[model samples]
Target: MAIEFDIQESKILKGVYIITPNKFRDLRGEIWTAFTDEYLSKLVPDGIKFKHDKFINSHFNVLRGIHGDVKTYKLVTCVYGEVHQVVVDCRKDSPTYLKWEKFIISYKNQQLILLPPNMGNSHYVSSAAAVYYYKLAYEGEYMDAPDQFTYAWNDERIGIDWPTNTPILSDRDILATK
Candidate 1:
């Protein structure tokens, strides 16, 4: 059997992508189709391409992102957890480069977020145990772009007011600054 997937534009954010399930709702819950190939082809006319990926689950105060696609268009969804996923456009060729955005995904409210094929982004799950799955196009190679820079998780530049008592990170992430 063949499966289909569709991408939906965000209502508030300019470039955010979402998966709008095809559903039939009534008084008795609802039945829905999560993906539609025809719609996806229409949304991303270049034809969808997926490569290597990563699956992660973080505990409360455990922040993971602000990571860019070394060379991948990532589709991220909160399988379980409360997280503040953030992304920054570091493409000098693109008009939106340097612009950043954030979205909260959690068990209380599950949502899908997509990143372009070559861009910068990051996220941190706020729940005790948040499951995160990310896809990367380049897989093993980290793209080298002048605009690519890591903003410390607590960098005042980004102004991320993390919750009290968050998990500590490795020396690399700890020493990472704007």
Candidate 2:
């Protein structure tokens, strides 16, 4: 058996990647590759190494981000259920600065996104329940919440038409400034 997959560069946001892994089915079950370093190396510059792999479980209407940091590259997808994932270019020097793109990823779709540094990551659990996965690559210490930057999801200038205006948010996200 062969592992088949499709990758496309984002038309809406520069330096972003969209990946869909083909699923193989049988009477017992189905399978597909979610990630691989071989592919990741081709997507990013040399010297950057994956340092973190995280998982998150969120409820419907829960929106987690609009958050980013300067030195990390993020690759994320929904492993169960569905999510409305959004990525915003935050690099002032980037050609697509402030441009935002949204993607629907779910167990059925199995889509993944690779984001460059200074790109904001946000997602809403559109389904009843969701399991989110993210693999991060960087050159230095990891950038946790304190080191990250937040671009308000509702910031008009950035312009993202989210599914909800009142998404459940943590204080950090709800009160984030431009």
Candidate 3:
């Protein structure tokens, strides 16, 4: 077959799988849907339901994430502008726990990164205004439990090399991520 596919094998995490969609084209200029239910189901057995959530930011240097839900798996796509995404696996019982991966998602690249539930994810957007469209399998109100906890965008333990010397933060995240 001309199309090729496989789960992106990672050196750090065992259960987490990232898939890049295959494209096909002929006189139609270039065509790639970027997702397929049957193909994606192989990666995420539970299935995928796409929902639109929007996050906008400026300052160019602010970092966000290393954030994940115990309830939902996330697939993030940059609908506009550009950003660098970092994900860390924190599941202690897993073989590849504490391993991390980084990707540059942008409108130019049309790249989307998949993140499993409970894996921490962080990002830095270079544009003055950045917008992202993300998919979540499970949905509902978020609780205040520690399981939903997030590290600061500048957490020392994660030690992500954010572009700016300083990043925007809330009083709570500053203390928590620090």
Candidate 4:
């Protein structure tokens, strides 16, 4: 029951982050106190830590990821219908490496996205089913490696304007572009 987030910082990327959780309307409708581990460790920053808590249930125009490797760190969220969140900045030397960002996270926008550590994510499911949520961090030991890596949610070299182009793929996102 600790919720008050509103930490936006990403004028295009540099330890990307953006959250805005705090809603409590009446009328039998809204009430979100999304995430609390002391308010998500006050928006993680010192020695970044966030164990694990994953979920994903997609449908309309489904598409999953631009995955990651090189020590993943993520904290995305949508928690229910509406999604379009994407992120990519493969951190080859930072300065917004390959640069890319798009977001929509919904459940009526109790947003959150913070994918640092060689970022790369993906999602698409604008309604009719979406429930994506994440919170993983691994820098030490957690070996279950397929050594995740897959970028090409339409990577014409990271173009990513993906709103649609016949989504709903799997088969490893259709062989994740080689």
Candidate 5:
């Protein structure tokens, strides 16, 4: 099958990509491919072998992340509503280390963000509710080793232009360190 989408690389961080799928509209509704191995393989040379799929239903003003692991890579998209998503480079030797890039993804935009290994991710729900879907690049359950870590969502060091200052967060996210 042919994939109709535009791939844009992030200028703020290396190895980060944004994909916008082409939408086909008709009397019934609209259709688009959320993902395809053929196209993804072109971008992720090792080729993405998704081992886990997760869906998150978040309410307005909800925020999550700055989470990442050296052994994990992720492809994330907003399947229902809109979100302000950010990814940060945390690799010790990355040229963009400690830097971040943001994107606005939604059902209408049909956009996806790729977070490579050692890159942290976070997002804020901007609509009534958002259904966030993601594919993880691990063959087993997510590991909680020293390689996995979470940074404060609002860390001044990263300075994300979050839509809101009063985002609702879980206890774990509230106390997460950089």
Candidate 6:
């Protein structure tokens, strides 16, 4: 079924978008319709053609990224649990360059964030475990780690006000600063 999403443009980041999907509830559990292909084609501007869906499941305190690519656009949601989501504008020529915004997406609220290219994102699992979903769209080959831009979580220039000083990290995230 095609669900009409409530799209809200971010006041802080120009190219960023927020979506609230339609939720249906009954004796059965709640169901939130993500999006339809036709809906997406018209939704995202500048010719963003979606091609893949991916999900990441993480435990509490797990922190993922301060990373993004110059080409891929990402639609992100917390499909299973609550997560603290941060998106940073890394477009050098943009007016909001280096600005960051934080949001909470969860199964209960069913909100989604649509990030444009050059926007960095990171998530801290706030619940016992959380599943983060990504609907990605791009033109050429998917930009893997080697082709992406990775930033420090505590970079002095951006200075994101993260919730904690310490979060579970991977060797890659630990060495992302360099």
Candidate 3: minimum summed lDDT over ten consecutive residues — where?
Answer: 45-54
lDDT (10s digit) by residue, model 6, range 1-178: 5457888889999978888888877898877777777655665666668888999999998988899998888889998889889999999998888899888887667888889889988998889999999998998788888898888887778888877889998877899766
Regions of model 1 farther than 4 Å from truth: 1-14, 22-38, 41-48, 93-95, 138-149, 164-167
Per-candidate TM-score against the hidden true structure: 0.68, 0.94, 0.73, 0.34, 0.90, 0.93
Per-residue accuracy of model 1 over 40-82 as CA lDDT, tens digit each: 4333325344555567867767765455544566667666667
Better of 3 and 6 by TM-score: 6
Put down candidate 5 lDDT per residue, 38-100, tens digits, no spaces: 677566546447667889999999999878886777889998889888898888898778898
Model 4 Cα RMSD, Å? 13.3
Q: Write down the TM-score for model 1.
A: 0.68
- Per-candidate local distance difference test: 0.58, 0.87, 0.64, 0.78, 0.82, 0.85
| Number of the predicted model whose TM-score against the real structure is largest | 2
Colliding residue pairs in candidate 2 = none
Tell me which of candidates 2 and 5 scores higher on lDDT.
2
Relative to the true structure, candidate 4 reaches a TM of 0.34
Could you arrange the candidates by lDDT from highest to lowest? 2, 6, 5, 4, 3, 1
TM-score-wise, the better of 1 and 3 is 3
**Candidate 4 clashing pairs, residues 3+ apart or interchain:** none
Local error of candidate 6 at residue 149 (angstroms): 0.5
Q: In model 3, how large is the Cα lDDT of residue 29?
A: 53
Q: Across residues 62-122, which tens digit of lDDT does each residue of candidate 2 receive?
A: 9988999989988899988899999998999887788898899976678889998888899
TM-score of 6: 0.93
